[PDB]
């Protein structure tokens, strides 16, 4: 009966897991092909830390199991959502690159638009998980703290 003490490891583990996510796009501007090595390494570190995180949840996956489903069923979709619209936009441009893909050579000169939409999208997420993490521990894990409100 030590599931309420798991959130502590999820809080300190979420900090870095959330930071690496923001850098994903910020670095995807060039890692999109120029150097995806950084995108393939960080993406494997997040999926590996999430699949293994369920290892310590064998004690009693009831309280944290449900709370983990509310966060595990939105992140993977939200991250792949904004990334799916971009990978589908460039392909929807002509709807048939097989017809005339010779004009892609002049596409390497991107305006880094990924940063334009990623700026407000990254700040919103960082503040969305920071205000929800320091709040959840209070309006859910209050019994864990003593004097500290947050």
Coordinates of N, CA and C in Angstrom, one line a residue:
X1 N 0.8 -1.2 0.0 CA 0.0 0.0 0.0 C 0.9 1.3 0.0
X2 N 1.6 1.4 -1.1 CA 2.5 2.6 -1.2 C 2.4 3.2 -2.6
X3 N 1.2 3.5 -3.1 CA 1.0 4.0 -4.4 C 1.0 5.6 -4.3
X4 N 0.5 6.1 -3.2 CA 0.4 7.5 -3.0 C 1.8 8.2 -2.9
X5 N 2.8 7.3 -2.8 CA 4.2 7.8 -2.6 C 4.9 7.7 -4.0
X6 N 4.1 7.3 -5.0 CA 4.7 7.1 -6.4 C 4.7 8.5 -7.1
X7 N 3.7 9.3 -6.9 CA 3.6 10.6 -7.5 C 4.9 11.4 -7.4
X8 N 5.6 11.2 -6.3 CA 6.8 11.9 -6.1 C 7.9 11.6 -7.2
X9 N 7.9 10.4 -7.6 CA 8.9 10.0 -8.6 C 8.4 10.4 -10.0
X10 N 7.1 10.6 -10.1 CA 6.4 11.0 -11.4 C 6.6 12.5 -11.6
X11 N 6.7 13.2 -10.5 CA 6.8 14.7 -10.5 C 8.2 15.1 -11.0
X12 N 9.2 14.5 -10.4 CA 10.6 14.8 -10.7 C 11.0 14.2 -12.1
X13 N 10.3 13.1 -12.5 CA 10.5 12.5 -13.7 C 9.8 13.2 -14.9
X14 N 8.7 13.9 -14.5 CA 7.9 14.6 -15.5 C 8.6 15.9 -16.0
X15 N 9.3 16.5 -15.0 CA 10.0 17.7 -15.3 C 10.9 17.6 -16.6
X16 N 11.8 16.6 -16.5 CA 12.7 16.4 -17.7 C 12.0 15.8 -18.9
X17 N 11.0 15.0 -18.6 CA 10.2 14.4 -19.7 C 9.4 15.5 -20.5
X18 N 9.1 16.5 -19.8 CA 8.3 17.6 -20.4 C 9.2 18.6 -21.1
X19 N 10.4 18.8 -20.6 CA 11.4 19.7 -21.2 C 11.9 19.1 -22.5
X20 N 12.2 17.9 -22.5 CA 12.7 17.2 -23.7 C 11.7 17.3 -24.9
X21 N 10.4 17.3 -24.5 CA 9.3 17.4 -25.4 C 9.3 18.8 -26.2
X22 N 9.5 19.8 -25.4 CA 9.5 21.2 -26.0 C 10.6 21.3 -27.0
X23 N 11.8 20.8 -26.6 CA 13.0 20.8 -27.5 C 12.8 20.0 -28.7
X24 N 11.9 19.0 -28.7 CA 11.6 18.2 -29.8 C 11.4 19.0 -31.1
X25 N 10.4 19.9 -31.0 CA 10.0 20.7 -32.1 C 11.1 21.8 -32.4
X26 N 11.5 22.5 -31.3 CA 12.5 23.5 -31.4 C 13.8 23.0 -32.1
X27 N 14.0 21.7 -32.0 CA 15.2 21.0 -32.6 C 14.8 20.3 -33.9
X28 N 13.5 20.1 -34.1 CA 13.0 19.4 -35.2 C 13.1 20.3 -36.5
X29 N 13.2 21.6 -36.3 CA 13.4 22.5 -37.4 C 14.5 22.1 -38.3
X30 N 15.5 21.5 -37.7 CA 16.7 21.0 -38.5 C 16.8 19.5 -38.4
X31 N 16.4 18.9 -37.3 CA 16.5 17.5 -37.1 C 15.5 16.7 -38.0
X32 N 14.6 17.5 -38.7 CA 13.6 16.9 -39.6 C 14.2 16.0 -40.6
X33 N 15.5 16.2 -40.9 CA 16.2 15.4 -41.8 C 17.7 15.7 -41.8
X34 N 18.1 17.0 -41.6 CA 19.5 17.4 -41.5 C 20.2 16.6 -40.4
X35 N 19.5 16.4 -39.3 CA 20.1 15.7 -38.1 C 19.1 15.2 -37.2
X36 N 18.3 14.2 -37.7 CA 17.2 13.6 -36.9 C 17.8 12.7 -35.8
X37 N 19.1 12.5 -35.7 CA 19.7 11.7 -34.7 C 19.3 12.2 -33.3
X38 N 19.1 13.6 -33.2 CA 18.7 14.2 -31.9 C 17.2 13.9 -31.6
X39 N 16.4 13.8 -32.7 CA 15.0 13.6 -32.6 C 14.7 12.1 -32.3
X40 N 15.5 11.2 -32.8 CA 15.3 9.8 -32.7 C 15.8 9.3 -31.3
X41 N 16.7 10.1 -30.7 CA 17.3 9.7 -29.4 C 16.4 10.2 -28.3
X42 N 15.8 11.4 -28.4 CA 14.9 11.9 -27.4 C 13.6 11.3 -27.4
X43 N 13.1 10.9 -28.6 CA 11.8 10.2 -28.7 C 11.9 8.8 -28.2
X44 N 13.0 8.2 -28.2 CA 13.2 6.9 -27.6 C 13.4 6.9 -26.1
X45 N 13.8 8.0 -25.6 CA 14.0 8.2 -24.2 C 12.7 8.5 -23.4
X46 N 11.8 9.0 -24.2 CA 10.5 9.3 -23.6 C 9.5 8.1 -23.6
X47 N 9.6 7.4 -24.7 CA 8.8 6.2 -24.8 C 9.3 5.0 -24.0
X48 N 10.6 5.1 -23.6 CA 11.3 4.1 -22.8 C 11.0 4.3 -21.3
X49 N 11.0 5.6 -21.0 CA 10.8 6.0 -19.6 C 9.3 5.9 -19.2
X50 N 8.4 5.9 -20.2 CA 7.0 5.7 -19.9 C 6.5 4.3 -19.9
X51 N 7.1 3.5 -20.7 CA 6.8 2.0 -20.7 C 7.4 1.3 -19.5
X52 N 8.5 1.9 -19.0 CA 9.1 1.3 -17.8 C 8.5 1.8 -16.5
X53 N 8.0 3.0 -16.6 CA 7.4 3.7 -15.4 C 6.2 2.8 -14.9
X54 N 5.7 1.9 -15.7 CA 4.6 1.0 -15.2 C 5.2 -0.2 -14.5
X55 N 6.5 -0.2 -14.4 CA 7.1 -1.3 -13.7 C 7.0 -1.2 -12.2
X56 N 7.1 0.0 -11.6 CA 7.0 0.2 -10.2 C 5.5 0.3 -9.8
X57 N 4.6 0.2 -10.8 CA 3.2 0.3 -10.6 C 2.6 -1.1 -10.4
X58 N 3.4 -2.0 -10.1 CA 3.0 -3.4 -9.9 C 2.5 -3.6 -8.5
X59 N 3.0 -2.8 -7.6 CA 2.6 -2.9 -6.2 C 1.1 -2.8 -6.0
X60 N 0.5 -1.8 -6.5 CA -1.0 -1.6 -6.4 C -1.5 -0.6 -7.4
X61 N -1.5 -1.0 -8.7 CA -2.0 -0.1 -9.8 C -3.5 0.2 -9.7
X62 N -3.9 1.0 -8.7 CA -5.3 1.4 -8.6 C -5.5 2.9 -8.5
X63 N -4.8 3.5 -7.5 CA -4.9 5.0 -7.4 C -4.1 5.7 -8.4
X64 N -2.9 5.3 -8.6 CA -2.0 5.9 -9.6 C -2.3 5.4 -11.0
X65 N -2.9 4.2 -11.1 CA -3.3 3.6 -12.4 C -4.3 4.4 -13.1
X66 N -5.3 4.9 -12.3 CA -6.4 5.7 -12.9 C -5.9 7.1 -13.2
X67 N -5.1 7.7 -12.3 CA -4.6 9.0 -12.5 C -3.6 9.0 -13.6
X68 N -2.9 7.9 -13.9 CA -1.9 7.7 -14.9 C -2.6 7.6 -16.3
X69 N -3.8 7.1 -16.3 CA -4.6 6.9 -17.5 C -5.1 8.3 -18.1
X70 N -5.4 9.2 -17.1 CA -5.9 10.5 -17.5 C -4.8 11.4 -18.1
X71 N -3.5 11.0 -17.9 CA -2.4 11.7 -18.4 C -1.7 11.0 -19.5
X72 N -1.9 9.6 -19.5 CA -1.3 8.8 -20.5 C -2.2 8.8 -21.8
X73 N -3.4 9.2 -21.7 CA -4.4 9.2 -22.8 C -4.6 10.6 -23.2
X74 N -3.6 11.3 -23.6 CA -3.7 12.7 -24.1 C -2.4 13.3 -24.5
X75 N -1.3 12.9 -23.9 CA 0.0 13.4 -24.2 C 0.5 12.8 -25.5
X76 N 0.5 11.4 -25.6 CA 1.0 10.7 -26.8 C 0.2 11.1 -28.0
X77 N -1.1 11.5 -27.7 CA -2.0 11.9 -28.8 C -1.8 13.4 -29.1
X78 N -1.6 14.2 -28.1 CA -1.3 15.7 -28.3 C 0.0 15.9 -29.0
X79 N 1.0 15.1 -28.6 CA 2.3 15.3 -29.2 C 2.3 14.8 -30.7
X80 N 1.6 13.7 -31.0 CA 1.5 13.2 -32.3 C 0.4 13.9 -33.1
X81 N -0.4 14.7 -32.4 CA -1.4 15.5 -33.1 C -0.9 16.7 -33.9
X82 N -0.1 17.5 -33.2 CA 0.5 18.7 -33.9 C 1.6 18.2 -34.9
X83 N 2.2 17.1 -34.6 CA 3.2 16.5 -35.5 C 2.6 15.8 -36.7
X84 N 1.4 15.4 -36.6 CA 0.7 14.7 -37.7 C 0.1 15.7 -38.7
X85 N -0.3 16.9 -38.2 CA -0.8 18.0 -39.0 C 0.3 18.6 -39.9
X86 N 1.5 18.5 -39.5 CA 2.6 19.0 -40.2 C 3.1 18.0 -41.2
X87 N 3.2 16.8 -40.8 CA 3.6 15.7 -41.7 C 2.6 15.4 -42.8
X88 N 1.4 15.9 -42.6 CA 0.3 15.7 -43.5 C 0.0 17.0 -44.4
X89 N 0.5 18.1 -43.9 CA 0.4 19.4 -44.6 C 1.3 19.4 -45.9
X90 N 2.6 19.1 -45.7 CA 3.5 19.1 -46.7 C 3.2 18.1 -47.8
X91 N 2.5 17.0 -47.4 CA 2.1 16.0 -48.4 C 0.8 16.3 -49.1
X92 N 0.0 17.2 -48.4 CA -1.3 17.6 -49.0 C -1.1 18.8 -49.9
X93 N 0.1 19.4 -49.9 CA 0.4 20.6 -50.7 C 0.1 20.3 -52.2
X94 N 0.6 19.2 -52.8 CA 0.3 18.9 -54.2 C -0.6 17.7 -54.2
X95 N -0.7 16.9 -53.1 CA -1.5 15.7 -53.1 C -0.9 14.7 -54.0
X96 N 0.3 14.8 -54.4 CA 0.9 13.9 -55.3 C 2.4 14.3 -55.7
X97 N 3.3 14.1 -54.7 CA 4.7 14.5 -54.9 C 5.3 13.6 -56.0
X98 N 4.7 12.5 -56.3 CA 5.2 11.6 -57.4 C 5.1 12.3 -58.8
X99 N 4.2 13.2 -58.9 CA 3.9 13.9 -60.1 C 5.1 14.9 -60.4
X100 N 5.3 15.8 -59.5 CA 6.4 16.8 -59.7 C 7.1 17.1 -58.4
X101 N 8.0 16.3 -57.9 CA 8.7 16.5 -56.7 C 10.1 17.1 -57.0
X102 N 10.3 17.7 -58.2 CA 11.6 18.3 -58.5 C 11.7 19.7 -57.9
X103 N 10.6 20.3 -57.5 CA 10.6 21.6 -56.9 C 10.8 21.6 -55.4
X104 N 11.2 20.5 -54.9 CA 11.4 20.3 -53.4 C 12.8 20.8 -53.0
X105 N 13.7 20.8 -54.0 CA 15.0 21.2 -53.8 C 15.1 22.7 -53.2
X106 N 14.1 23.5 -53.6 CA 14.0 24.9 -53.1 C 13.2 25.0 -51.9
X107 N 12.9 23.8 -51.3 CA 12.1 23.8 -50.1 C 12.9 23.7 -48.8
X108 N 14.2 23.4 -49.0 CA 15.1 23.4 -47.9 C 15.3 24.7 -47.2
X109 N 14.9 25.8 -47.9 CA 14.9 27.1 -47.3 C 13.6 27.4 -46.5
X110 N 13.5 26.7 -45.4 CA 12.3 26.9 -44.5 C 12.4 28.2 -43.7
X111 N 11.3 28.8 -43.4 CA 11.3 30.0 -42.6 C 11.3 29.7 -41.1
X112 N 11.5 28.4 -40.7 CA 11.4 28.0 -39.4 C 10.1 28.2 -38.7
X113 N 9.0 28.1 -39.5 CA 7.7 28.3 -39.1 C 7.4 27.4 -37.8
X114 N 8.1 26.3 -37.7 CA 7.9 25.4 -36.6 C 8.1 26.1 -35.3
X115 N 8.9 27.1 -35.3 CA 9.2 27.9 -34.1 C 8.1 28.9 -33.9
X116 N 7.5 29.4 -34.9 CA 6.4 30.4 -34.8 C 5.2 29.8 -34.0
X117 N 4.8 28.6 -34.4 CA 3.6 28.0 -33.8 C 4.1 27.2 -32.6
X118 N 5.4 26.8 -32.6 CA 5.9 26.0 -31.5 C 6.2 26.9 -30.2
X119 N 6.4 28.2 -30.5 CA 6.7 29.2 -29.4 C 5.5 29.2 -28.4
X120 N 4.3 29.6 -28.9 CA 3.1 29.7 -28.1 C 2.6 28.3 -27.6
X121 N 3.0 27.3 -28.4 CA 2.5 25.9 -28.1 C 3.4 25.3 -27.0
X122 N 4.7 25.7 -27.0 CA 5.6 25.2 -26.0 C 5.5 25.9 -24.7
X123 N 5.2 27.2 -24.7 CA 5.0 28.0 -23.5 C 3.7 27.6 -22.8
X124 N 2.7 27.2 -23.6 CA 1.4 26.8 -23.0 C 1.5 25.5 -22.3
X125 N 2.3 24.6 -22.9 CA 2.5 23.2 -22.3 C 3.3 23.3 -21.1
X126 N 4.4 24.0 -21.1 CA 5.3 24.2 -20.0 C 4.5 24.7 -18.8
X127 N 3.6 25.6 -19.0 CA 2.8 26.2 -18.0 C 1.6 25.4 -17.7
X128 N 1.2 24.5 -18.6 CA 0.1 23.7 -18.4 C 0.4 22.5 -17.5
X129 N 1.7 22.0 -17.5 CA 2.1 20.9 -16.7 C 2.7 21.4 -15.4
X130 N 3.2 22.7 -15.4 CA 3.8 23.2 -14.2 C 2.7 23.7 -13.2
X131 N 1.6 24.2 -13.7 CA 0.5 24.6 -12.9 C -0.4 23.5 -12.5
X132 N -0.3 22.4 -13.2 CA -1.1 21.2 -12.9 C -0.4 20.2 -12.0
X133 N 0.9 20.3 -12.1 CA 1.8 19.4 -11.2 C 1.9 19.9 -9.8
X134 N 2.1 21.2 -9.7 CA 2.2 21.9 -8.4 C 0.8 22.1 -7.7
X135 N -0.3 21.8 -8.5 CA -1.6 21.9 -8.1 C -2.2 20.6 -7.7
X136 N -2.0 19.6 -8.5 CA -2.5 18.2 -8.3 C -2.0 17.7 -7.0
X137 N -0.8 17.9 -6.7 CA -0.2 17.4 -5.4 C -0.9 18.0 -4.2
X138 N -1.6 19.1 -4.4 CA -2.4 19.8 -3.4 C -3.9 19.3 -3.4
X139 N -4.5 19.4 -4.6 CA -5.9 19.0 -4.7 C -6.0 17.5 -5.1
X140 N -5.1 16.7 -4.5 CA -5.1 15.2 -4.8 C -4.1 14.5 -3.9
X141 N -3.0 15.1 -3.6 CA -2.0 14.6 -2.7 C -1.7 15.4 -1.5
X142 N -2.7 16.2 -1.1 CA -2.6 17.1 0.0 C -2.3 16.3 1.3
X143 N -2.8 15.1 1.4 CA -2.5 14.2 2.5 C -1.1 13.8 2.6
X144 N -0.4 14.0 1.5 CA 1.1 13.7 1.4 C 1.9 14.8 2.1
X145 N 1.4 16.1 1.9 CA 2.1 17.2 2.5 C 1.6 17.5 3.9
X146 N 2.3 18.4 4.6 CA 1.9 18.8 6.0 C 1.5 20.3 6.1
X147 N 2.5 21.1 6.0 CA 2.3 22.6 6.0 C 2.3 23.2 4.6
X148 N 3.1 22.7 3.8 CA 3.2 23.2 2.4 C 1.8 23.0 1.7
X149 N 1.3 24.1 1.2 CA 0.0 24.1 0.5 C 0.1 23.5 -0.8
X150 N 1.0 24.0 -1.6 CA 1.3 23.5 -3.0 C 1.7 22.0 -2.9

